[PDB]
Amino acid sequence: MDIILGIRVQDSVILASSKAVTRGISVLKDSDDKTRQLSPHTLMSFAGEAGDTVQFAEYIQANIQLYSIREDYELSPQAVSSFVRQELAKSIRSRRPYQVNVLIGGYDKKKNKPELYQIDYLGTKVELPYGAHGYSGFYTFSLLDHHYRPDMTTEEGLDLLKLCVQELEKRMPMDFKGVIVKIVDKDGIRQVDDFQAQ
Amino acid sequence: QIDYALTAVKQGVTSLGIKATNGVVIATEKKSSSPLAMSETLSKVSLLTPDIGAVYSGMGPDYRVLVDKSRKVAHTSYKRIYGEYPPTKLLVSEVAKIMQEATQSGGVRPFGVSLLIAGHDEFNGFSLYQVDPSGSYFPWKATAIGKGSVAAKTFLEKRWNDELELEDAIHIALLTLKESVEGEFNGDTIELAIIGDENPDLLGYTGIPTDKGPRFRKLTSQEINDRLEAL
Amino acid sequence: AGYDRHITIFSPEGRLYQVEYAFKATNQTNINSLAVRGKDCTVVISQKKVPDKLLDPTTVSYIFCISRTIGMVVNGPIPDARNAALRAKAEAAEFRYKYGYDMPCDVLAKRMANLSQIYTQRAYMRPLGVILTFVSVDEELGPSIYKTDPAGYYVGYKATATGPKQQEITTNLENHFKKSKIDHINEESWEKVVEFAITHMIDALGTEFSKNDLEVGVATKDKFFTLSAENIEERLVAIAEQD
Amino acid sequence: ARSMIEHARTAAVTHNLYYDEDINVESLTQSVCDLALRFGEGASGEERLMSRPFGVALLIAGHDADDGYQLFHAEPSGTFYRY
Amino acid sequence: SDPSSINGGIVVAMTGKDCVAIACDLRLGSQSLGVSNKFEKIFHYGHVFLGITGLATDVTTLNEMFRYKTNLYKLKEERAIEPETFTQLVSSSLYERRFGPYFVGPVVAGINSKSGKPFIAGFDLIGCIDEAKDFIVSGTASDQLFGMCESLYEPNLEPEDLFETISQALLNAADRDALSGWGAVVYIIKKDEVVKRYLKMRQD
Amino acid sequence: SPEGRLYQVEYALESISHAGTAIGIMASDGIVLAAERKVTSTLLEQDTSTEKLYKLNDKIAVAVAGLTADAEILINTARIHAQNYLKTYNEDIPVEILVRRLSDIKQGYTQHGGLRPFGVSFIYAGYDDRYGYQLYTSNPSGNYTGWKAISVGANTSAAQTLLQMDYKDDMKVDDAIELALKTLSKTTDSSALTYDRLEFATIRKGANDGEVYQKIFKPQEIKDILVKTGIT
Amino acid sequence: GTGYDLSNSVFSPDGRNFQVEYAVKAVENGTTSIGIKCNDGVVFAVEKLITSKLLVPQKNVKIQVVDRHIGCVYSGLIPDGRHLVNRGREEAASFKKLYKTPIPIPAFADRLGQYVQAHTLYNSVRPFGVSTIFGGVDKNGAHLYMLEPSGSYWGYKGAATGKGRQSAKAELEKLVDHHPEGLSAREAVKQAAKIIYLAHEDNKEKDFELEISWCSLSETNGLHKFVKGDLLQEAIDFAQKEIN
Amino acid sequence: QFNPYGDNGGTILGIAGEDFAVLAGDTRNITDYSINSRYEPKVFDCGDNIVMSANGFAADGDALVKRFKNSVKWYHFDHNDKKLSINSAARNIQHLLYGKRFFPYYVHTII
Amino acid sequence: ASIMAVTFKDGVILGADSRTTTGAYIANRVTDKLTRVHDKIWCCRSGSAADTQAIADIVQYHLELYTSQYGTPSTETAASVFKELCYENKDNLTAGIIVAGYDDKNKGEVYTIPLGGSVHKLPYAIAGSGSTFIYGYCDKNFRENMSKEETVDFIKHSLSQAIKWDGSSGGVIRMVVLTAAGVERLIFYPDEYEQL
Amino acid sequence: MFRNNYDGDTVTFSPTGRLFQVEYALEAIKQGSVTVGLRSNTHAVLVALKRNADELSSYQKKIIKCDEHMGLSLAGLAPDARVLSNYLRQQCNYSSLVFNRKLAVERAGHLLCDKAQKNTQSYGGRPYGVGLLIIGYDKSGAHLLEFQPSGNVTELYGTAIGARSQGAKTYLERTLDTFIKIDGNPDELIKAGVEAISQSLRDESLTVDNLSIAIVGKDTPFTIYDGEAVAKYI
């Protein structure tokens, strides 16, 4: 594992997600979007077990695109979160447990606020200003502690993000082959494809 | 078809119930299908929980297997979860649900009995309920069911005030039953139960002061005759 | 249409046609039975009718041994009697195993009457054309006599009778507990209680019996057994030498 | 006949899988008849799970290398002739 | 590795003069790494309070569950559920999954509205009801808390006093505990008023 | 089902125009529910039942017109859907979704024609933060419909007319409390309306803030608002 | 409503299950079959009718064997005899498997009794179309039983059922009269052959083979062997002599 | 513990000719270090000019031969006595073997 | 445990110690290892107390029911019901049982059911933990057709030894005599069997 | 006119003791073409008359192989025979696998009887509606059986079932002592089977497409001759 980051600012939520897919000895792909769009204003990045990872995120994508289509209402982030959680908590005492960790970030169109949720394969859910799974947290949480203000512009927050990735490339043994940064705000989910040199 | 079962209820021995301020009372008659039979071997007034009893009118057997199914449901659906016994309102609900299912289920006829269930729960106080074959159930200050139904129901409106002590309601439910009585009228052909004060006498043990014993007490062959003399 | 006469559902006047008919079947054998209580025994006399000379009397029995303690006598077609006896012989073995004491007479009856009730409330099963008379010397209640019927009803009798000339026998007994004003037969040895049960039946039926026209069942504490061909002739010989 | 066809397409591919050859027209036909031969609501012995005779006739025509070109009439009754 | 000891946290409850108090730390961490400092371990259902320590996804699941169960008790029973009763529902409820338990260490605390009597009790993961007049403890500082309470407690504390007492027991155990801390909250429950103070403690 | 007709349904749909009589009025800042009670005996215990006005959740409630034992079987399962949508999404269930959830079970028998349809017709009064205050209707047909004011049961066709008359969109909540009682002037087979033949309910903008209180009236509170005109 | 006789479980107004009584009529209209209990075993006999000349002699066996020591013969709907004897064996082998001793005759009878009787309990299964005569030798000697479609069964000294019912029953009563102590195992066989030959005059239209089997504690050491060859002619020739 | 598998040894060889094919095996059947039989054949005629050999664990191969020899009896009854294409029996054997994929017939098998 | 059963002229006699041990601790020193499944058919239990108890309990039933319907059960049958339970459940049981009884035909009959679930009819049989030490004494000192008190003595000695040498055996020595004239329960105390 | 009240289903006995629903099935036999069966001490033969639909259609097969030692012919309801011939094919193939034993003919008789009987106890299902002539050579000689849907299976030297069954049934009845002595001759026992099935034809003419023959015994496994193979017997 496998880099899953995210920071919630003033006007949006930002998710970083390592681009690399490794199969033991060889690096198979240098360009993996580790995230499914759950709906216009709700994004989910993820990492963990081999096949278990995607298969889950897609099951959630389906089930939320279905509640969207049915009530022609865009399910709020708090709810998408508390649903994904229950779906993991269900599978932890199941036969073969989904072994997946996720970051859900999205814009609550009704509170006009951004929200970031962190959920581990066990069903452990908490809401955060910033978050990460795997070991990603150790190198970066010390920086966020220090440089994070909750009034940060979306621009101010991209800067702080690049600073975390830089520290991960320096003191982390894995070659994760970069990140893909996505942003979630009032206007929806867009992707910054100019990052490893901004 | 539910309508035909209510009809088996309309005949078959009369039974009644009266709520008071400090107790409830239910009674029916024990019509002996013979003098050879010992009428003490059959109970028309049965305990469901130590705070709740029941009486019927109609088909004997259907009552028995309903009193049994009923005791069990009190444990399986309440006592084994919350450690308490169920409240009159809800145990009644769980019996109506039981009979209402014999209705709407295929291959089975509804029960040939109307039930009068009397009891006391700590929060709702006293209450007396009627349950019909239809699975419907209603709360009563007092009523009667069976043949003598109409005579007795009219007598109860005439004699009932909301200031009755339980001893007053025992007195009434004996008169009420005296006019309808089919056979003889004594302690051997009357069954009367009450839901009154806690009876510690009848717990079977002593040492925890938090549980104080059955509110349900079934009057003995003697206690009845004693009241009928000063009657 | 007019099909509330064929299954166990309610007629328009709250009647169960099929049960009332089921009762009518209990006579179809044409045997009469009676049962009595002693100071500490219980007795059941039934008639034995062996018309076919090709039969083997020893195999012809409407008296069943249900347990060590519990006896049962059936009025009704043989097939149905056995269906009931076999089910009781097994409800009482199960009872002993699950609960640790021998199965008590009145509990076995409540359990067969409960059964007899389901038949009375389910479309697809039919009641049995039998009236099961249960006897024992139950360890808590004393001599017991409990009878269940196709209706689902059970109750306990001082003494009882069942079958075709049921009411002639019943009214004889009634007039002998109106007269001793008790709930039993004050004789110690069961032998004299068996003699009494045969006497008050001869009286009520107006015919004499030979060692071959009777079946006797007896319950003392710790045993229920049936009297042999000869164990009865002795009982008859004693009646005749005082009457 | 939607279901009657689904079973025939499914039977023909299933045979191709289990045996690496195209399935005989005679046996593809009989298989379809063996399907509409499960008509009923009460069967002891073997269960025939469905509700009514299959309300459609079939002309089945194809080619296998044993018995040249073939034409068959499948009836709802579960039997057939090779016209 | 050890489920009770992954996220950690502690919960403690005491009685006083016609009052009760329950308190916890706001810590949630995967092993060594602290993740959240705003994760409360105490939930309420009517006037009955429930603190739960141990595994997060089970602490959370049981809240979500008892809300459900008690919400229906209110609608079906026409009243709010009592503490004595809810206790018995947590027991039977936990013991439902006897051979695949919720890795939790629940503490029930509140005041019986009919008898006005204070009530606390705690459980093990399969529902043994430890009812106690004095105090109940639970968590990764099972031991430390028992140490503090056994010394600092006297029965019949006035409420404004029992806050100081329960706060000091909690605070000083979690400071000698690696997996507890990062904040703390303390409910004081009078017969009809309920005050919820947050505390200042080290943050390490 | 001869001409395109739902027979076993009309059977029970008109069995409804017999039992009970219920009303719902949506004000601009609240909702109102109301019902008449079945043929009462002197000795029937008035206060207990709450026989035709049931709470579903802290923000939703239904009025019933139909067979009691039949609606309880429905409500029991609807109080549960409520709580499943909580334990699942940690938000209170939206009114339309609960309504549809029932309507779909009603229509479940309106088609799997091997079991018997539902008595019972519902007025639902609820609030959810997506569609302000809401008023709904539920015949055993399976259909539900939006309403600014509505009625079910006996004398239905009649009240719908007075309602159409005295209703104004700017209506307050207390203004709608009256309109409900007032127009159970007519639609009452019992000459003169008492507090005991009644059952009442409100979902207001809270007794305090910007939120939502729910209130099933206790008998005394009815004899108090009955005081405003009805009887005095 | 009326119609009290189209359904099986259904009680007529005076206690009768009519469908059963109809089945007994199917019994009465079939091959005649008997059983005799002698002093240390049982002998069984059946009338095999001969539809045409093409039926093979000796090769359509009607008497079925249960376990090793029990014989069954039936009259009526033949396939119902087979379905009953099958359930008869599943039962006799449940018993042996668990209690080791091979199933006692009286206990075997009670087991068939309940299968049959249980086919008189629901509107949706018809009673057996056979009265079955069966028996053998157990720990306490010989037992002969007969079991009609109603479930009724009793132990007989001799028994008959079939078209020639009343006729055999009467010759049977003649032996129980002359020899109270029972016949000899061998004699009972000679006589069963007489009795069948007689009860054939009630069906004298078609021709017939005789079939006898026995179970004797002295002549087949407790097992159920068939009667064949010399001993079969022994009796076929004894019948011819008491028919002429 | 109980161990449901064996080695009975032996050795088979199959060669494809131009107008023919041979399929040879030894006759020795063993358990460990002892000899079981010197003659117990390994190579079988299955009809429709197909010979096969399931070698390794005898019980599993014996059982697999039985089961295919039977697959032939029924491809006959089911498809009007048609000849089983060599290539088709191969595929049917794949489905036979893979049926017990998670508890295989412990045999290297040649037809 | 430490149990045995012997046949003779008049019937059969069952014998056992009374010591159930869990570990080194004697949890009960007065155990009734002679258990009754019918008037005159008893067993000797050894192995798990929980297993032998459950089985005998379940056999007592099968036989009470067999009596109800079919009559009095051969001693042979009791054995078959035991074997059927022990064998068909071998994977989950640890019980070695001796079934012994008296009918009138055969008189003394004894069946030993080892752990496997096999069944072996014999003149006498020993079993239980402390049996190992008396295979020698018994084979040398047993005779067929012994007298009643001859057999009581044979058992008293055999079991006096087993208990001397076994730590998993001891307590009092219980016997149960099964004859036509009825059931007689015996007991011999330590002060007696040790002095032999 | 004359209505029947006891012919509703199979769970219903007529007052005179008759299961009408079975008697009706026993009649479905006669609603299909004629087939014939006979046996010497060494062989068993079947002759059937396959019937067609148009001049433009195939002929219904009337004989089905069961094992290499046993086969049967059908007259009546086809699917009912496909269902029974299949069950027989199984037991035959099970007696082979488990016991490595050719399934006795006398025993498949007993097994079909009990299979068909099941369909006359049950409410809902109709009885089997087809007749079967079954042939085989077992460890006990040649064999022929008649299977009527009532359950009654009977062992014979010869018989015939179906449309005008009566022509042959009467020929064989007279030929008896002649053909059962046709041992060691195969061609001659078929010559007889065919001279018997042709008593049951009117002005009707056997051809290569009308005729279906099967044979079995001692050292001849059950083989079926349709088409040109049958010419030599016309």
Three-state SS for F175?
helix
- Closest C-alpha to E74, from E46, E36, E113: E46
Q: Which two tokens stand for residue F57?
A: 């959740």
DSSP-assigned letter for residue J27: T
Domains and CATH numbers, chain G: 1-244 (3.60.20.10)
DSSP-assigned letter for residue B39: G
Quickly count: other Cβ atoms within 10 Å of residue D19's Cβ. 21
Contact B107 C122 (CB under 8 A): yes
Residues in chain B within 8 Å Cβ distance of C155 = 33, 37-39, 41-42
- Per the CB < 8 A criterion, the answer to whether I15 and I6 are in contact is yes
Three-state SS for I25?
strand
Three-state SS for F71?
helix
Q: What is the largest CA-CA distance in chain H?
A: 50
Q: Which two tokens stand for residue F124?
A: 């639902």
**Alpha-carbon gap, residue H72 to H81, rounded angstroms:** 9
DSSP-assigned letter for residue H82: -
Three-state SS for A44?
strand
Domains and CATH numbers, chain A: 1-195 (3.60.20.10)
Pick F68's closest partner by Cβ from B136, B143, B153: B136
Pick G53's closest partner by Cβ from J13, J114, J176: J176
Q: Does G9 touch chain C (CB under 8 A)?
A: yes
**Alpha-carbon gap, residue F199 to F65, rounded angstroms:** 12
- Per the CB < 8 A criterion, the answer to whether I98 and I155 are in contact is no
Nearest Cα residue in chain G from I84: G98
Pick A89's closest partner by Cβ from E28, E57, E100: E57
Please give the CATH number for the structural domain made up of J4-234.
Answer: 3.60.20.10
**Alpha-carbon gap, residue E158 to E198, rounded angstroms:** 20
Q: Where are the domains of chain E?
A: 1-204
Contact I69 G97 (CB under 8 A): no
C48 Cα to chain G: minimum distance (Å)? 13
Q: Which two tokens stand for residue C203?
A: 């009286």
Q: Which two tokens stand for residue C125?
A: 């099963």
C-alpha dist (Å) from residue B6 to B29, C213, G42, G150: 19, 47, 60, 37
- Per the CB < 8 A criterion, the answer to whether E37 and E23 are in contact is no
**Alpha-carbon gap, residue C224 to C102, rounded angstroms:** 13
Cβ neighbours of residue E65 under 8 Å, at least 6 residues apart?
E93, F87
Q: Which two tokens stand for residue E50?
A: 């429930």
B32 Cα to chain F: minimum distance (Å)? 31
Residues in chain D within 8 Å Cβ distance of J57 = 73, 81-83
Host domain of residue C130: 1-243
Q: What is the DSSP secondary-structure string of chain D?
A: -HHHHHHHHHHHHHHHHHHSSPPPHHHHHHHHHTTTT---S--SSS---SSS-----EEEEEE-SSS-EEEEEE-TTS-EE--
Q: What is the DSSP secondary-structure string of C46-111?
A: EE-----TTB-GGG--SEEE-SSS-EEEEES-HHHHHHHHHHHHHHHHHHHHHHSSPPPHHHHHHH
Pairing of strands A13-17, A181-185: antiparallel
Contact E114 B81 (CB under 8 A): no
Q: What is the DSSP secondary-structure string of B165-178?
A: -HHHHHHHHHHHHH
Please give the CATH number for the structural domain made up of E1-204.
Answer: 3.60.20.10
**Alpha-carbon gap, residue C102 to F122, rounded angstroms:** 57
Residues facing residue I26 across a β-bridge: I21
Return the exposure string of H91-105: e unless at least 16 CB atoms fall within 10 Å of the residue's CB, then b.
bbbeebbeeeeeeeb
**Alpha-carbon gap, residue E202 to J66, rounded angstroms:** 89
Which of E:136-195 have CB within 8 Å of A?
A: none
Q: Does A131 touch chain E (CB under 8 A)?
A: yes
Q: Which residue has tokens 């092993």?
A: E31
Residues in chain B within 8 Å Cβ distance of F69 = 96, 100, 134-137
Contact D/C (≥3 CB pairs under 8 Å): no
DSSP-assigned letter for residue B77: I
Q: Does A88 touch chain E (CB under 8 A)?
A: yes
Report angle CA B10, B11, B16 to the nearest 5 degrees: 65
CATH number, residue C62: 3.60.20.10
Contact J/B (≥3 CB pairs under 8 Å): no
DSSP element (H, E) containing G188: helix G185-198
Q: What is the DSSP secondary-structure string of I74-142?
A: PHHHHHHHHHHHHHHTGGG--B-EEEEEE-SSS-EEEEEE-SSS--EEESEEEESGGGGGTHHHHHHH-
**Alpha-carbon gap, residue A48 to B46, rounded angstroms:** 62
**Alpha-carbon gap, residue G48 to J143, rounded angstroms:** 20
Nearest Cα residue in chain E from F55: E75
Three-state SS for F116?
coil
Q: Which two tokens stand for residue B137?
A: 């159930």
Cα dihedral across residues I156, I158, I159, I160: positive or negative = positive
E-assigned strand segments in chain H: 12-16, 21-25, 29-31, 34-37, 44-45, 51-56, 107-110
DSSP-assigned letter for residue I181: T
Residue G32: what are its φ and ψ, rounded to 5°? -95, 135
C-alpha dist (Å) from residue B147 to B57, B144, B153, B177, C153: 9, 9, 11, 11, 20
- Per the CB < 8 A criterion, the answer to whether F40 and F87 are in contact is no
Return the exposure string of G51-73: e unless at least 16 CB atoms fall within 10 Å of the residue's CB, then b.
ebebbeeeebebbbbbbebbbbb
- Closest C-alpha to J224, from G68, E18, E33, H76: H76
Polymer length in residues for chain J: 234
F71 Cα to chain E: minimum distance (Å)? 14
- Per the CB < 8 A criterion, the answer to whether J60 and J50 are in contact is yes
Chain J partners (3+ C-beta pairs within 8 A): D, G, H
Q: Which residue has tokens 């004359």?
A: J2
Contact G55 J154 (CB under 8 A): yes
E74 Cα to chain F: minimum distance (Å)? 10
- Per the CB < 8 A criterion, the answer to whether G143 and G106 are in contact is yes
Residue H49: what are its φ and ψ, rounded to 5°? 50, 55
Three-state SS for G171?
helix
Quickly count: other Cβ atoms within 10 Å of residue G190's Cβ. 20
**Alpha-carbon gap, residue F111 to F115, rounded angstroms:** 9
Phi-psi category of G78—alpha, beta or left, where left has phi over 0 and alpha has psi -120 to 50? alpha
**Alpha-carbon gap, residue C167 to C175, rounded angstroms:** 12
- Closest C-alpha to G75, from G52, G51, G107, G44: G44
Would you please indicate which residues of G are annotated as catalytic (active-site) residues? Answer: 31
E-assigned strand segments in chain J: 35-39, 44-49, 63-67, 70-76, 130-138, 141-147, 153-155, 158-161, 211-217, 220-226
- Per the CB < 8 A criterion, the answer to whether G225 and G213 are in contact is yes
Q: Does F83 touch chain E (CB under 8 A)?
A: yes
Angle of the E56-77 helix axis to the F68-89 helix axis, nearest 10:
160
Nearest Cα residue in chain A from E40: A126
Three-state SS for B52?
strand
Q: Where are the domains of chain J?
A: 4-234
Cα of first residue to Cα of last residue in chain H, in angstroms, is 34
Cβ neighbours of residue I170 under 8 Å, at least 6 residues apart?
I2, I17, I18, I19, I26, I29, I163
Quickly count: other Cβ atoms within 10 Å of residue F56's Cβ. 24
Polymer length in residues for chain H: 111
Pick D44's closest partner by Cβ from J54, J78, J125: J125
CA atoms within 13 Å, Cβ hemisphere of I141: 17
- Per the CB < 8 A criterion, the answer to whether G214 and G44 are in contact is yes
Residue J70: what are its φ and ψ, rounded to 5°? -155, 135
E43 Cα to chain F: minimum distance (Å)? 14
DSSP element (H, E) containing E164: helix E159-174
Contact J53 D77 (CB under 8 A): no
Polymer length in residues for chain F: 232
Three-state SS for E124?
coil
Contact G78 J169 (CB under 8 A): no
**Alpha-carbon gap, residue B203 to B214, rounded angstroms:** 7
Contact E92 B87 (CB under 8 A): no
Report angle CA H8, H10, H16 to the nearest 5 degrees: 135
Q: What is the DSSP secondary-structure string of J80-106?
A: HHHHHHHHHHHHHHHHHHTT--PPPHH
Q: Which two tokens stand for residue G108?
A: 């075997």
Cβ neighbours of residue I122 under 8 Å, at least 6 residues apart?
I110, I111, I112
Cβ neighbours of residue I179 under 8 Å, at least 6 residues apart?
I10, I11, I102, I148
Contact E88 B83 (CB under 8 A): yes
Cα dihedral across residues J113, J117, J118, J119: positive or negative = positive
Peptide bond into A2 cis (omega under 30): yes
DSSP element (H, E) containing I54: helix I49-70
